[model samples]
Target: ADVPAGVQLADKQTLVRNNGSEVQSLDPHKIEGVPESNVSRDLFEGLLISDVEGHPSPGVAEKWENKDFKVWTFHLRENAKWSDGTPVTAHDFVYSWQRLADPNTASPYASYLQYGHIANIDDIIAGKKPATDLGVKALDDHTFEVTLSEPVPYFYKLLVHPSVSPVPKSAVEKFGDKWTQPANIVTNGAYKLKNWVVNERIVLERNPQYWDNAKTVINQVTYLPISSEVTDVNRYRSGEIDMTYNNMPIELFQKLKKEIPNEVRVDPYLCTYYYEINNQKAPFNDVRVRTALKLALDRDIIVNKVKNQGDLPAYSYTPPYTDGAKLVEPEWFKWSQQKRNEEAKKLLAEAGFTADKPLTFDLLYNTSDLHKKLAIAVASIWKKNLGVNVNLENQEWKTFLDTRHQGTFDVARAGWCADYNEPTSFLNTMLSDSSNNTAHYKSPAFDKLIADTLKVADDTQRSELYAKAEQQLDKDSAIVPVYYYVNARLVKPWVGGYTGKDPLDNIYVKNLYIIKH
Candidate 1:
């Protein structure tokens, strides 16, 4: 992430930024982690690009229109060209998507278009049909058309993900998987793969042929894969890099913010922190008991005091910033503190918890000081309100994840970051079929509502459906909505156009410039 001490602002336009961990792959279709997205986004431009606020605008496709959310048409920029000086056409997108959907290709994000509801995507992925059946067409060199199996309100948001970006079909066919190698890669973004040294760094240089490359200020960018957050902070302080991967170390955040107030960027990220209740467990399975536990706590206190990092108290699973959606307030959320406490006691007694047999359970959390603090506050609140006994269990990251996956705890630490800019990104995790639903929670009513969302023809109606799903999850007490997440990062003040407004936290180097010190 650095050019060394001897450089001393020698190459002002060469930005060295933390890329988090070593990227898993340069192939957009093969990536599964944030670091991979962080790197790939600059090397590939999708049909639709995302704006600073996590809404789709335009990229390869300069303009687009939809008809009832089922059929869409896009008009590509005439100036769009690849690093190799070749035209980027609609055919490239069709090929890219077909490659991803092909069973033989085995893309990790093969299910990406499933969210877009591309006609026959399910059949293609299930081996019932070939990838060629994917409902995308190159109506002309600069025009693309798509048909969905059903109306999808958030389909435009899905288009901006790296997985939907066009691949160089010629490069893929000539070099096979080696096409991602820097020497062979051909991209249509503002940057090209300049170099890649495994576990050390990945370097990118400007794409001369990119449509807007003439106006770009940064000439070269280097991504260093530093794993430890503390190490990133130290590197940033020592002039090793211009910015961190993201997130300042929690223990040092307050001090960092005080010392470098301009560099410490704290903004709302599209994620929610929560505790997963094992709905299949005996006591928790009792609706009355689940309701009582959910009602008895104060979310506002937890966010404002215990682990505050500009977090929002989350009464609903989805964050309030989600595009075009209204927050659905749970009925119990309107009750006064005293009223909720009394109601909780009544429900706990109704579930047959007597004074002699008071309710008790272990709450599992990952090993973090802030997590421990939140756990302590929640346990204290529940005990004070409902006369319950709670045990706190702390485990390492790997073990905590495995424990939750195996369903070995009564209540386990869990949080979800949105995969897209829509409410469904949060709600889909609770779908009975999702591996994310570690609690094994199932409700026919909730599942039906989600399924109905796919068929809704109107955008406003679709958002209303998402709101209902949020309320349903709250009503079912599937999980405790503790707080929403805010990304904490240290960015150099010298960097320009680095707005931390995007909920997905994506950065485009083409939009950045270095200012005079």
Candidate 2:
């Protein structure tokens, strides 16, 4: 296939793309969604960055070693420099880590510090101690040392997360919140922010001062925040954008596969689409009600009829293929539809709901055509099977996030994509103190199981404990795991060196270049 009629290649290498959502924030410490993450990967350099395969490789730090089971040391590249020509140093990372842990910064991801790995993390996050008390230290200008409270065998992979990146203290203090604005910001990654227009587009130009500039072929990148799936597909078709990732609707999947098979991409994603049952609220607070709600709806219908995107109906909170752990599906989830429906009705009745005094509540989802369709379908199932009255409400993305975080809704749409490939990434979100736990479910026993996981050094024993941790979600009906996600999108054939096929859906512009057609 030739390049589309209107599409023209620039003299400089460019990859015009749709990033799927309007970036909420550009500061790595405050980033909350995947859209911000996509931008962060281009504008910030961590100790390690993910390759095209989502595996950790050297970024600013050329190499690293675990001195023992608990202390890790990283040797930074001597040539690394910020976009403003300031030398990258260990203290930059130290400042960024402290900012992330500080309560005043109010980062939603600050709860990540409570992974119980970083020494004094709990106290720092609790404001009982200063952020300077965190386990990280600058051994020298180019050397970074991190002492974990406990062993994490897969800790290296966790460093690939955007939250762990270094931010220049001078830039942040000089610009304040405006540090992310293109005119005021300074970055150290392969690309520098060239332009940013809210709810419209962002432009990035190659960083001349980047450590790996010779290997970074893409001279410029443009991200158009495509909030609507229809607009994203239309722009891709019109040759206005070279690629769109994960914004396309499942309804358009088969059509794109038939009409332009080469451009369409569907790949494995380490994500789960589920609904959070507000454990702080009544009705949902009861185990019987939560169990009844989970069993009443048919997951097969949601996957086959509503999604029809080859998504697997998930019975476990942790998706398949997680490292060192087998999938944990509860026995009740395996029951036949007829049997499940019968039990669901009995449970609802036992929980003091009936045809006269019916269980009624709103099901909330973010505003999207596909989400609305899924909500309606599931609502219908509950109405028919359990004699429940369900109202559906949809809010825009930001509002939806705030609503769920505030725990104002009865049941709300939620999804978790792994920050790291391990089982802990998924399991830890539901932990008693985790900030990401929208359901607000608390179980000290569940909390102990997760904490105990850190003490088990044996590979087999650790994996077994992870399975038990996942089972806790099922036993408590902490959430309703609807299905696992598959990344489906469109990519121009002219794009080379970058394959949009990673489980994490991570895109590295440093690895992307245009092939002359």
Candidate 3:
């Protein structure tokens, strides 16, 4: 009965980096990508963490002392030891943090550690100061002290993140060429890398040396990276695999729904799919043109026909559900259908567009089977409602991105999933001149609201700031947000204990168990 309305998804795309790399010396510190990070989390420990409910919880640090706002101290687990039998010392923590703060390293997620509270970290990352200027220090082998730039309430929640993982200085220096290789790998987390075959599979053996080894029931776990959902589904069907991911074709999905409705799973992900217009460019420079483009979007048709009503239509930037807490809806949603249509028409007219002489622009899309369908539906809607002729340009993903970065497209379709729970994660990073605002879309007032809201500690005040900023975002026509994601997955009955995480579903494989049956 449940068929997806549309899809904005990735398939088994290959990013071939570090070929012939070892798993033995793969430090959790260098972790990136959903697959790599999830695997690394299994082999490492951090000071503190958030439980599934988003509450501050304990991890490697049995307890911590932060009575003083400036300097926070942590008590490490005495039992913490590396897979190679080395004690996890305060030095390991100190060195790892300093490395991330180092300017030359160029870590993408480095911002995770640097907020108002991270003193001199920005200077350190920008090469204004020496790495030692960063506020982390090892008081003793098992004791650690970190002074922040200011008090950060969520500092503890950011602890278990990869940038804070303990790094062994010796491993980096000694095995410069062969580190992270299978036989050379050393791990402190519950699972150690046993093997990694490129574009194939990675095997993980449970770490006997872990502090929580007793609680880990998995003996050996394997991760297979397949880009094709058809192949993945077949593997699961043949009892060769336990779980498969999203990106199922619509017809195939409907067939599966008919055959095994209970086995197919779908839920909204904390992601937003939108189309960006380069505001600095000609057609989009006019607010009238942007408003005309948005008016043409009949989200009801897009969601029902293209997405199979799988995704939720979003007028606001914020994905309603975050950490299981939903946000406020658009005030207009309560209005009658006649009223809503009238408002949409008024907004269009205010921009100087009507049934005739409607604005025309290029809608650049990625060359994929699914994207083509979505793009065609949108173009048809724009043509039907706004009297605008949309020229759909289907470029390959890379070419599309490069041209967008160069500001060559009038409109481009894309999506954003927040890296973390912060509101800034959704807007600031995209609208800020420094971010990947591919559209070159900007507004001083909107930018200011985002920056100002970062300083507000009150959740209500901050959320209101974001809500206002989002309204400005829509007013600017920064993008037409079609929907927030509803990622669907198909799992077999044999696959037990797999829990989904949100706001950025970093799949917690440590909690996943496969029963032999």
Candidate 4:
């Protein structure tokens, strides 16, 4: 027998593949994670959207022209509308772009939009110029224009991002600071957020007036922030949930080895799991001790033992597969155990640490059991290999953030998933002079390389520059590279008609259907 009815067993968003499709929401500006972006994509229509193969395609703006590198023209879809039935005009696009560039808004990814693509955007964002100088303008109601600082081949692809999605002018103008909350929110995509109860769950209902309503499959949907692996897995097995990702527990992996063979999956993620060394901290300030701690761990053993296929051992920040092509791996990560141990000892001695006068440090990790196992394993390696008494401290997910942001820990495990498929997307955030880096790693040469690659259109030159930057990160050991990420999920047999999506696992159900058993 099936479960009770009020919830969309698949949430309210079930589709027989005949009637509808549901995306997570309409607010795309602050949606940082790809999982959230995937959901938001369904609810909001952009000038462009990614195809199944992850290539950019025209969505609302069906046709466009690059008049030249400095100027662009776009033709908006005649039918796009807000949830309240207001037409999504060219002016709305202009308004939304300006809002993102607004000095007071503080959009984190604004830098992405500021440089390269939109002309003078950086100047405007930095207060060097007014919003009028921003490179976008609405020629008329359905036609729009854009200007760029430099020639950008991926300009259109970037526009497919939610940051480029149009927000309702009336909604923002009406609600002011309260626009993003419920009751006043408006949507132009296939789904409208019906309810959001914070950590409990977020529900989205179909928008009948969606421009591409004909293609929407699921009718309604719900998102539950299930941080625990056991709970996520148990819910899926008992049919309480359809799918789940990340932080899967080890005990369940053994239990479900045979029972859910087909459902269980682990795939590559464009992410790197690493430990950052806070320079402000003492022992870590000494590169010798930091290098010693890094050399002692066996990344292979950690991946196989603690991660349980959830992640791969990482030697570098760039994941192996990027932009559908394989990336180059450096030789440093595949070192032999004997060499690793020998190097570790030398580094320790150089740092003035002996077996009796070992360096003491507190390494912090998240509360997840997987993290706990990983921490203890690393602690053991340090104690045995370098005679360092590394203390492991565990904090709940929220507290972990406080400690990390405040730079409280000497060493801490951090995970960074790619915001986009670009190599710069991963490396720039952590090593560059960016907020996300938090470790305060500053390299003038590193910063110049990143800036050059991003600001100018020199593919071959950019690649060479980035290689140098990555090499610098390795030499400095700003962060102890631990693992390349792999995301796993289990789906029920009945959950048919859905296909694994690309770049990131945003299950777009517009083309998916539930099978009638």
Q: Which candidate leads in lDDT?
A: 2
lDDT, candidate 1, 362-452, per-residue tens: 9998665556777888999999988888999987544576677677889876777677887877776677755456777998889888888
What's the lDDT for all of these models?
0.81, 0.84, 0.65, 0.68
- lDDT string for model 4 (1-517, tens) is 1222332334344631110112223356654444456567767777877665455677779899885455778899899888888888899888888877766666655665653358777677778887666778899999988888766555665676677788887888888766767698888877787886755666778888888777665677666656566777877777667766555677677668677788776665667778778865776777777677677777877787666575677776667565522344566567886688789889889878876777888888766656677788888877777787878887755566567767778888777775556676666665443545557677777777666775656676666666767776677777788887776667666565444555554345554444443
Ranking by lDDT: 2, 1, 4, 3
The TM-scores of all predictions, comma-separated, are 0.79, 0.95, 0.77, 0.85
- For residue 137, give model 3's deviation from the true position in Å: 2.4
Q: Which should have the higher lDDT, number 3 or number 4? A: 4
Rank by TM-score, highest first.
Answer: 2, 4, 1, 3
Looking at candidate 1, the ten consecutive residues that score lowest on lDDT are 1-10
Comparing 1 with 3 on lDDT, the higher-scoring candidate is 1
Encode model 3's per-residue lDDT on 316-415: one tens digit a residue.
6667665322355656545553455556566667767656666677888765445667788888876666566778887744456568778888888876
Candidate 4 runs further than 4 Å off? 1-27, 67-70, 114-117, 279-286, 324-328, 352-358, 362-367, 388-409, 454-458
Comparing 3 with 4 on TM-score, the higher-scoring candidate is: 4
